[PDB]
Write a protein that binds this ligand. Structure first.
Ligand SMILES: OC[C@H]1O[C@@H](O)[C@H](O)[C@@H](O)[C@H]1O
Ligand SMILES: OC[C@H]1O[C@H](O)[C@H](O)[C@@H](O)[C@H]1O
Ligand code: NA
Lengths: 339, 346
């Protein structure tokens, strides 16, 4: 079943319920995921109206871009030329700059396929918007099916050579409550390397590091508290995890990651080469989710994309988008329950 | 009363009914007016769904900007610097550029004041968007009251020195039928001069001309057919009217224009210095409005703003907006009945 309702400020709430009784909700404000629930329990973090996101934290569940992550000094080079993007976190351009795409009302169309329902959100980013060459016509289709697969398919075409590398910023919390650390969940991740951060500014340090046999090797499922109680300078640096992990094997068929709590597990599939993991290291901030004060470590992201820092570490990849080339990305979050 | 419902593609349709029974409705797609009816008759042109605007004509009833009209070669000078804007009409920048603000979903909040209801739409134009320095925090409030006054109030603040001069693109047609020409409407307009256009590209010629005693003199009411039938060069150039009229007396207090058909009149008030009048010179295009093929001359706009061309005719005004400075503009369209005697035939 599909239900559409007013989410506040003119945005809509589109709720989909599959054959299994599982309900996923999205809003056009930022082409985002608002809730995901089973047997009455939220699996992800989310607010109860548009205003909240605007007032509290605009990123949760949002499609962020055009470039996800931090760009040092807001500087990219396009076809040999340097371009300075909007700078919104010191000199860095973070998630596309201020008042970026996650704060806009996207247009959308719903497509009911039966076992599968698609919600296609569309937005045009004007040439020069926040310094980005365009125009860029973007669409993000979030779909939900009877097999409990929530899939995100991105597509884009630009009139000029530009940069493009968006991501989905959903925060998972299998405890169903923000006041509860995710240190009790277990994580498995098919990555033997990561990208260390230079410092508190969170720009990349410059190198690629081997994680095998360290507190960050989740190659073998392991509990989060491990990483959390590690003395590794990198962990201590951010007070948790807030880094890109390079996947060992690329391809949409491979389960790249798994997050488990009891009988409940989320499997991550993507065609992207990297996963950025941030464990809501908010300290005492205490953002309120559903009347619950959020705790340090009260959520975790799986930002699938090309790793931030390719501006200084080219090996990471190349995020350019040539005028006329069609960009495509796919990321999937599969829900499972042991019987 | 106020009613809201989905209008298509994610937009809403906000419908107000005042105490007199007059209904007006807006959509956050382009912070635009969609319809205005009296006794079941449409006083304006509009479509039935959001997709119609996107597929047929995205300008009717829309808020357009950041700069309304054509900027020759998209070139503006801001604080001694030249900036080139998006060029969407040949080398010209028409109505802020391609995929401009009239194409976006604005957020909104409704305030019920009882005798007056306000719909405040908001949008942020990012710095660099279409070439304009910013960011620009914009807001358009559309309000309707028990006195049948539809009012538009614009506010804006930029982080940087930029240019701003938006307008409202409604089209009236008192026949309530697009396939009916407005040549049968009477027009009264407090303007003695106009701005001629250089040629078919529609950029300004460079001079300001006196139109008194010509077929474009509406200081004293006359049927629109007088203009439409005129063979004056400027009229033949655009096949109707499509020019800026310079108001003789400035101020929000003055009825600068009045459009009448039989017992119904629409009065125009504004704090702007000019009214750009475009009489839907589309020839045989025949855009369908409510299933009626629109006719040449099947509608008339009253775009209140600083006249286009100030880049060339500095005398028209200054559309620059300084960083931190608050822009404001107000335009009011008020409806009346039996304001005068208008009994004609065509
Ligand atoms: O505070 C650091 C974090 O900031 C977030 O906005 C970002 O999405 C995370 O991946 C992480 O880098
Ligand atoms: O074609 C000329 C015409 O073009 C557009 O529709 C404008 O909005 C009108 O004001 C007028 O200048
Ligand atoms: Na809605």
């Amino acid at each position: 079943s599909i239900k559409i309702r007013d989410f506040g400020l003119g945005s809509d709430l589109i709720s989909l319920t599959n054959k299994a009784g599982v309900t996923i909700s999205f809003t056009n404000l930022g082409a985002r995921i608002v809730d995901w629930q089973k047997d009455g329990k939220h699996l992800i973090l989310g607010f109860d109206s548009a205003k909240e996101y605007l007032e509290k934290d605009a990123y949760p569940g949002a499609t962020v871009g055009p470039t996800a992550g931090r760009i040092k000094d807001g500087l990219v080079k396009i076809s040999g030329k340097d371009y300075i993007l909007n700078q919104n976190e010191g000199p860095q351009t973070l998630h596309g700059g201020e008042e970026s795409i996650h704060t806009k009302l996207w247009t959308y169309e719903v497509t009911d396929l039966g076992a599968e329902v698609q919600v296609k959100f569309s937005l045009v980013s004007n040439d020069g918007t926040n310094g980005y060459p365009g125009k860029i016509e973007m669409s993000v289709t979030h779909s939900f099916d009877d097999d409990n697969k929530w899939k995100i398919h991105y597509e884009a075409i630009s009139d000029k050579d530009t940069v493009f590398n968006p991501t989905g910023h959903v925060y998972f919390n299998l405890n169903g409550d923000a006041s509860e650390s995710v240190e009790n969940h277990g994580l498995r991740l098919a990555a033997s390397r990561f990208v260390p951060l230079k410092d508190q500014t969170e720009i990349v340090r410059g190198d690629i590091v081997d994680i095998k046999n360290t507190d960050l090797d989740f190659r073998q499922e392991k509990q989060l508290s491990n990483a959390f109680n590690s003395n590794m300078e990198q962990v201590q640096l951010v007070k948790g995890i807030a880094h890109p992990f390079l996947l060992d094997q690329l391809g949409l068929d491979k389960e790249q990651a798994r997050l488990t709590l009891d009988d409940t597990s989320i499997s991550v599939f993507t065609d992207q080469p990297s996963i950025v993991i941030f464990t809501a290291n908010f300290g005492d901030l205490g953002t309120l989710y559903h009347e619950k004060k959020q705790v340090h470590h009260g959520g975790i992201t799986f930002e699938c994309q090309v790793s931030p820092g390719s501006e200084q570490i080219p090996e990471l990849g190349d995020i350019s988008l040539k005028a006329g080339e069609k960009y495509q990305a796919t990321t999937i979050y599969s829900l499972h329950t042991k019987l």
